[PDB]
Amino acid sequence: AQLTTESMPFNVAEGKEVLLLVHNLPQQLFGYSWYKGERVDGNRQIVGYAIGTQQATPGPANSGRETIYPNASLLIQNVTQNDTGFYTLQVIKSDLVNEEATGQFHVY
């Protein structure tokens, strides 16, 4: 089945925490990139993650409060109104035929 992401919890109190879980990662991965919003856009990149070295590198939209895990999961702490809405994950395969999934939680 399709690459998918869900957020835990779906509705998050301001100041609390949310984990973006990822399911059905394909094989032969090179890396992951998370973006704020519904689309892949470098200006809105949160983080880039190289699997070979297990190394996270921040993008322009990185808040300082995000952590990516080896299975692509994204933890966000001390959430703000600004964190609310859509997130997009791009999975970079080793053949560079890539996949995206979006991506939502609601701050209250």
Can you give the binding site for its own copies, defined by CB under 8 A? Answer: 30-33, 39-42, 45, 48-50, 55, 57-59, 90, 92-100
Q: At its nearest, how many Å lie between ligand BOG and the CB of residue 22?
A: 3
Q: How many CB atoms lie within 10 A of CB 53?
A: 8
Q: Could you say whether residue 84 binds ligand BOG (CB under 6 A)?
A: no
Exposure b/e, 18-30, CB count within 10 A at least 16 = b: bbbebeeeeeebe
In sign, the C-alpha dihedral spanning 69, 14, 62, 89 is positive
Q: CB of 33: closest distance to its own copies in angstroms?
A: 5
Q: Smallest distance, Å, CB 59 to its own copies?
A: 5
Q: How many CB atoms lie within 10 A of CB 76?
A: 21
- 41 is in the binding site of which of its own copies, ligand BOG, none (Cβ under 5 to 8 A by kind)? its own copies
55/72 Cα distance (integer angstroms): 12
Measured in degrees and rounded to the nearest 5, phi and psi for residue 99 equal -135, 150
Q: Which of 3, 4, 21, 41 binds ligand BOG (CB under 6 A)?
A: 21
* Contact with ligand BOG (CB under 6 A) among 4, 63, 73, 102: 73
Q: Would you say 74 or 79 has its CB closer to its own copies?
A: 74
